């Protein structure tokens, strides 16, 4: 293990992650043994308990008490299932904070803190919405999930417009309620782009939002990333900046590569500092000497001299990550078997704040169907692949959040799923009709932290 | 005949532009006419582009007119064409000569943002319906300076609620870092004024048609919009944040507008008000400026509980303003516009449009996509069925998005945006379409800058 490795924590996220994995993967074991019983008298009752012992719930009794005139109807059952063990995995989350990074908690009032010594008073992150990312911020960087903003986008390419405006609310919030902290304090907003690449198999297993070439997932990051930037730079008088952090992982390690940047941003793409050489360069080291070599690597990596706090945040997120590494190591072998996308269900609207799992779901945003169909299509291809191929239908998740203090955004949030919804039964009537895809509807309240709510279903009884 | 508060020159120079771009509209079809008698002459080609040069001030299409004699003269395209490049022409005179006098910079729209921080108020938002019978509410009914107010129209004035508390946290942050309109710490309110209309006329069938023609259930729902956006904001911030609200309606036969004035708090009866009519006849005889302070008295009487002295003094001049309109509408109208119902010459859909300011001009539909715009934009293409199509002529579709010329990429994103509203039209549409009763021009404009709309895409291909 490295001197660096956060060992328990290493623990505690695999227990998490075995766990949540183990809930959904259990179904299809279950229904198989169901399905063998339905000729049974007692097939009902039979089946409830077998459910309950094994899921932990029960199942729609109109579905188990009507198997005898069609036959049992699975391909309804297994998406039921995944939307019922969605929404306990999504329940316990915010209930049980598995992370121990909620708002409040010790880690995240810790990090806040440190990001503004730093030098910065707000972390906005995009990654790739790639399935196989979703725990970036949680395992990889091991950051608390609210001291950060994460939003997600196919290949990490962000709303350049919409960031803007995420950055005047930012400083509206310094300026009234010197929240983080006072506006005239000289920090700035820090936005990320987190792009990935396949180590192992780098000509198929890449981002596919750019044809699986790291340049272009790469340059398309920092293209937004510097736009970003520049809008600012034109949009308001006086100093009027933001910095810059353009970042990789490899989906088949977790290693992340920095493209340490100078004081304005000036980032180089040709040129990186991968975790994995930092892990080798420290792994004989002392825990407080290693330290420091990963600090001098970072200086040393910039593109030109480099921002002081810019240097010690990344040295601190090189460190967090090297305990990825290892985690990979300990429990992967040191690469995924699930390389490429394992995905259980399909996640359209917002970025989902609960779900901080590896290949757990394959997220597409959107805010209309009309809009990013592309992006949503190439999900249904995926779970064609991975559960039409078997019989079973593609489970679809539509969130939105809305701001429960606006009166009626609840009302508008629920609709505006409803408006989704009959746009997927739409676009997909052949796999709808013959029962191969289901939604769920639910919306998320974001002005304070309690779960999602269920608002309903293409299953209907 | 005229009302001392009346300003004539004014109503004479508005009358001579509504008067030059209606007329340039009007006089599409009898061209069209005239080509058409001479489809199998000779010089069919060359007395064709003359006429349009003379008449129109631009040129037709050459392989329209030059097939004409085998695929016969494609009217349905020739009259698309035409009104989209007198669309062109009249969007660029306003932006190039100003019309309304109402420019950024012009002494017009410094005087008013000076009266209106005055009265209380850092900024002005209006949401009129999209109706084009309401189009020239602000730059005729109320005589505002157009580039002093933020004009969102949406049908039955419908305003998107969390998108209004941005706009508000926008304006707030520029004044906190640049004191634009004003310091952040002065004690002024940003206003959102619902504006909803109905016709004295023929109240059942004339009114607002997102509202079933119902001038009370208008009036009402603007309202209900107007608490809303102040709930927003009261519930959003810290430290008492708070805004201003100003319901109010116009009729659309005679443009007197009726105010429900409110008390300090936004407080406002639906069912009492103060129309522009009776504030007209109460001060008919009398000198300018006892005039002024009786439209004063009225106004301040007419207040649901005790009204804010700052909005008892902008109303007053709402009311001075819509008294020069009401005798507009009298001297050159006859007193009722003879097109109560709908006229526009085109439907205009996306961003509402900066430079239309005119009656009957645009039955407009606010969308981002066609997937949340579709009613509405179904309600103007069954219009244009009566208008256009009944007759054998095409629905000309503009499509505008607005977007900031300081984002890089911010054109091309509003271009891509206009392409995939085209898309989504035609689909929508496929029968029109396809029979050539149906086209679109796209437009984008950047909103950094007092600049002409840019044409980037038709229907119209060759
Ligand atoms: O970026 C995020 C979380 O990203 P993700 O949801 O993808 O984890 C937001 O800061 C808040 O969570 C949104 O609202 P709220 O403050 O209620 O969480
Ligand atoms: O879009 C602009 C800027 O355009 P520009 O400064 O280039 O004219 C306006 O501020 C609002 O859209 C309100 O509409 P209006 O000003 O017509 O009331
Ligand atoms: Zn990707
Ligand atoms: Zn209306």
Redesign the pocket.
């Known amino acids: 293990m490295h001197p660096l490795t956060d060992a328990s924590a290493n623990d505690a996220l695999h227990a998490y992650d075995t766990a949540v994995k183990l809930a959904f993967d259990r179904i299809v074991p279950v229904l198989k043994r169901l399905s063998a019983l339905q000729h049974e008298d007692d097939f009902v009752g039979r089946a409830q308990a077998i459910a309950l012992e094994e899921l932990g719930f029960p199942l729609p009794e109109p579905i188990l008490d009507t198997a005898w005139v069609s036959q049992l109807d699975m391909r309804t059952l297994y998406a039921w299932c995944v939307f019922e063990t969605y929404e306990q995995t999504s329940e316990a989350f915010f209930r049980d904070d598995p992370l121990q990074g909620q708002?409040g908690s010790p880690s995240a009032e810790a990090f806040d803190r440190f990001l503004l010594d730093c030098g910065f008073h707000l972390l906005?992150?995009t990654p790739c919405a790639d399935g196989r990312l979703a725990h970036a911020?949680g395992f990889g960087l091991r950051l608390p999930?609210?001291s950060?903003?994460?939003?997600?986008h196919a290949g990490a390419l962000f709303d350049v417009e919409n960031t803007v405006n995420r950055w005047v609310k930012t400083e509206h919030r310094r300026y009234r309620e010197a929240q983080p902290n006072p506006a005239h304090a000289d920090t700035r907003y820090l936005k990320v782009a987190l792009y990935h690449f396949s180590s192992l198999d780098p000509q198929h297993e890449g981002c596919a939002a750019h044809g699986s070439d790291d340049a272009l997932a790469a340059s398309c990051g920092l293209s937004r990333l510097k736009d970003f930037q520049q809008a600012v730079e034109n949009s308001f008088c006086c100093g009027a900046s933001v910095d810059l952090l353009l970042m990789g992982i490899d989906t088949d390690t977790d290693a992340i590569r920095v493209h340490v940047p100078g004081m304005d941003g000036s980032t180089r793409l040709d040129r990186w500092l991968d975790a994995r050489d930092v892990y080798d360069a420290t792994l004989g080291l002392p825990p407080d000497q290693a330290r420091q070599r990963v600090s001098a690597l970072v200086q040393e990596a910039a593109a030109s001299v480099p921002d002081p706090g810019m240097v010690t945040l990344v040295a601190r997120l090189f460190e967090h990550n090297i305990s990825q590494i290892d985690y990979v190591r300990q429990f992967h072998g040191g690469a995924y078997d699930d390389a490429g996308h394992a995905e259980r269900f399909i996640g359209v609207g917002?970025?989902?704040?609960?779900?901080?799992l590896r290949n757990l779901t394959y997220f597409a945003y959107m805010d209309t169907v009309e809009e990013g169909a592309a992006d949503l299509d190439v999900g249904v291809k995926i779970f064609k692949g991975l559960n039409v191929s078997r019989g079973l239908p593609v489970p679809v998740v539509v969130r939105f959040?809305y701001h429960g203090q606006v009166p009626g955004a609840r009302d508008r949030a629920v609709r505006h799923c409803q408006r989704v919804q009959t746009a997927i039964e739409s676009r997909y009537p052949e796999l709808f009709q013959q029962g191969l895809l289901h939604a769920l509807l639910t919306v998320?309240?974001?002005?304070?932290?309690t779960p999602a709510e269920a608002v309903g279903s293409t299953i209907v009884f």
């Open positions: 708002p906005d992150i911020i999930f609210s950060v903003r994460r939003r997600p917002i970025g989902f704040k609960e779900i901080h959040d998320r309240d974001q002005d304070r932290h």
